[PDB]
Amino acid sequence: MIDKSAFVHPTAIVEEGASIGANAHIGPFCIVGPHVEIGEGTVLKSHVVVNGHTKIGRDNEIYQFASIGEVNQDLKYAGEPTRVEIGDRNRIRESVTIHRGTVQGGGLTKVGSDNLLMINAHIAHDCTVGNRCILANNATLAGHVSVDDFAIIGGMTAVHQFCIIGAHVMVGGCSGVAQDVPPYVIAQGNHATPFGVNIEGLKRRGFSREAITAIRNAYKLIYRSGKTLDEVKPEIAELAETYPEVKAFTDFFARSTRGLIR
Amino acid sequence: MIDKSAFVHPTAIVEEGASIGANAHIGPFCIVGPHVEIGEGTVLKSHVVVNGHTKIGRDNEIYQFASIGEVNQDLKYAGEPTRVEIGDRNRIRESVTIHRGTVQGGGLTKVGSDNLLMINAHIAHDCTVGNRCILANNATLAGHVSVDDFAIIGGMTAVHQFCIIGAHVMVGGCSGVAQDVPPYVIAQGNHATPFGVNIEGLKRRGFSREAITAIRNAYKLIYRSGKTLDEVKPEIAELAETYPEVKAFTDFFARSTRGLIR
């Protein structure tokens, strides 16, 4: 149902079954499918397509020519009723594409809250994007990719299937990310390699001097010590006992399937 | 007001206050905001969004899915009444984005005349594009970038914030430009480095043999002499006394804030 306080432009097409929240705005020439839920205060500016089994949160701003919930590009996909979930206060810019999941990948593409998805950013099937992320122009997440909180992905960067971009990571523009990026790391190149800790990001987000030093020490264990990952894991866990910010490494290691960028 | 000789398609939405010039053409499903001025003979093919405080000149051709005058992607922008100015006879292709300025950056995004902006070219807030430029497919100008007359920016190239692309420059495809590019230079790579003078461009644009040689000599002063820029500046100014085409270097040096690509 369409809330009495929602605005639906006369030229927009909202299919019977769609749920449109209070003070939402469906602009001219938008198409909203029957399995779509659009939350309170969310704005579709104009020329937006939203379809599939798709739930969108509150106070989002979705710009013209975006395609949200659409059939994904996986050749294995066969029309199964998979899903998209998008949180609150996202800015989803012109020509952004966010595709529905595949059964094989878990059935769900998920985006958190307070993200900025810049022009032509692509979120393929089965991706999970956290909160407070930035995907710059033409940033492309291939299928099954995870982008953790606060991560920034530079212009024209592609993240290969199944890779994890850790929390507070900075990926430089025109990069190709072929393996997992630990949290707090600056990554650049094709294939992408590590270039130290994202110190400025940590500063801006209220990390203490002690936390930043500990994170740098963990980085050094992984990349400077000359030891294998299996050797340094307990050392990092040991370090995390004093500085809890370091636990992000541990949690990331447990999820990592493609090995670390080096 | 809409000129009596303008065509506005019945499906187009031209908001009260918009100024539409003589023999302009507003195609199907276009949206034109109340602060927009569209000059004589300018054509919006279909599915074009033009908004903000935006002035567009004469005889432009703007293709489907372009977004002109839109809210920029700067996280600092807060809705201030900033501006876009576009000149005459531009060809603005499918999915091109040209965003309004920020107060912090000067309030204005400007594009000159006789430019070709190819598919998905992006002109961020506070950019200034001159005349007779080409931005190839997916060419991306970050905020505050200047592109001078006759410059050609290759496919998938990103120009980083505040950088200047000098007049008659050729930037190779898939480049990442992190510093200023002197006029007349061929630049390529990530980060982009110089690869000599754009001789063919100078030939095609009527530069004399003497002018081209002088320009090559100036290039050699900057890049081959082994001297610092401060040392070679007066030598270039000296050379410009005989060959006025060399003055472009002087004028560029005065504007450059990020140092030169090397």
Binding site: A136, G154, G155, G172 | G143, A158, Q161, G176
Partner: peptide, 12 residues
């Protein structure tokens, strides 16, 4: 510091 998301950097 200035964020340049397209470059993917915090400017020095």
């Amino acid at each position: 510091w200035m964020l340049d998301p397209i470059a993917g950097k915090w400017s020095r």
